[PDB]
Design a protein around this ligand. Structure first.
Ligand SMILES: COCCOc1cc(-c2scnc2C)ccc1CNC(=O)[C@@H]1C[C@@H](O)CN1C(=O)[C@@H](c1cc(C)no1)C(C)C
Lengths: 103, 90, 143
């Protein structure tokens, strides 16, 4: 069962899909192919919670019912900077303007 | 698997599958004119993120028999998203 | 060209609304005239009596947005095999992002105030060109 995700770090957002049965480590291998950072230099999160490599995406709360193509679930990403991992930081998207009077 | 980077007016970088981005004929022309990066000086991240969700939704549900859900659009972004969709031809 | 064949051969159909819209079924009569039939609320189905060779199309009853039936524009009732009714699965199409945006904007702004929106003139005309059956019948005729 496919889950649709947004892997987000700072001002980077990766749009990708994965199996609900696939693991956090397998998702780190996906990120490695894109951002060129090995899985040992990555930390994946669901909100403020660090995810375990051996856990499936379904076990981490990424279910097909909550990670939809039109409304994907967010996976936080933090990279290892030399000795220590940076704090999880996700830059918010811009704020829409005020709705015009006619709307 | 080839990916492309779509950069919003406010500097957010969206990495999407090349096949998904090619939903837009305008994007296809900007890629086949770094090398797999397109900058959108007029499209902010609250609009460009939604365009990427549209590409995922479109590729997933096109020619599909599994009941199609509504593509959600918040009223606050509808006007700029309409303009982006018109420029992108999608 | 687009009209029902007067076969007089019954064909039992299930109109199954697998969309979030209120559905307006439209029968193309023997002269090609669109005839509206009772509406179907979202997620509901109806067993209806139709005929082989007859032509149907389905729209959102409030806005006239086009819908798909068995993945295509037109539904033609066929031969019932072993008394099984034909399913007419009505679904939302994958609208273009532009058409989907035009739908959302039309639902928030009164037609009088389309001209007050800060958009290019072509987009005002796109908003005013509301979905319609006659326009689609002419599009489908030319094709
Ligand atoms: C039977 O009581 C009135 C209701 O009739 C109906 C309601 C519905 C719908 S569509 C959504 N909800 C409902 C309930 C659908 C069908 C019907 C009745 N069924 C019909 O009206 C069918 C549908 C279409 O094929 C034309 N037709 C005919 O009967 C035509 C006909 C007769 C012969 C001979 N050849 O064509 C007639 C109008 C000239």
């Amino acid at each position: 069962m496919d889950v649709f995700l947004m892997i987000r770090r700072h001002k980077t957002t990766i749009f990708t899909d994965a199996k609900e049965s696939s693991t956090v480590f397998e998702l780190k291998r996906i990120v490695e192919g894109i951002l060129k950072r090995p899985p040992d230099e990555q930390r994946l999160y669901k909100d403020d919670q660090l995810l375990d490599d051996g856990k499936t995406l379904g076990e981490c709360g990424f279910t097909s019912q909550t990670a939809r193509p039109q409304a994907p679930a967010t996976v936080g990403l933090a990279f290892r900077a030399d000795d220590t991992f940076e704090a999880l930081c996700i830059e918010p998207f811009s704020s829409p303007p005020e709705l015009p009077d006619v709307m | 698997m080839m990916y492309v980077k779509l950069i919003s007016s406010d500097g957010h970088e969206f990495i999407v599958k090349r096949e998904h981005a090619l939903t837009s004929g305008t994007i296809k022309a900007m890629l086949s004119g770094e090398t797999n990066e397109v900058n959108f000086r007029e499209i902010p991240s609250h609009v460009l993120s939604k365009v990427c969700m549209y590409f995922t939704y479109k590729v997933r549900y096109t020619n599909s028999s599994t009941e199609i859900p509504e593509f959600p659009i918040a009223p606050e972004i509808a006007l700029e998203l309409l303009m982006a969709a018109n420029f992108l031809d999608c | 060209v687009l009209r029902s064949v007067n076969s007089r051969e019954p064909s039992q159909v299930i109109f199954c609304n697998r969309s979030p819209r209120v559905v307006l079924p439209v029968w193309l009569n023997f002269d090609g005239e669109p005839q509206p039939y009772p509406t179907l609320p979202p997620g509901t189905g109806r067993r209806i009596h139709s005929y082989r060779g007859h032509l149907w199309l389905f729209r959102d009853a409030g806005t006239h947005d086009g819908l798909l039936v068995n993945q295509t524009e037109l539904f033609v009732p066929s031969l019932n095999v072993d008394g099984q009714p034909i399913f007419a699965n009505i679904t939302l199409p994958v609208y273009t992002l532009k058409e989907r945006c035009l739908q959302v904007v039309r639902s928030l702004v009164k037609p009088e105030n389309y001209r007050r929106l800060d958009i290019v003139r072509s987009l005002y005309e796109d908003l005013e060109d509301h979905p319609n059956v006659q326009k689609d019948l002419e599009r489908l005729t030319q094709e």
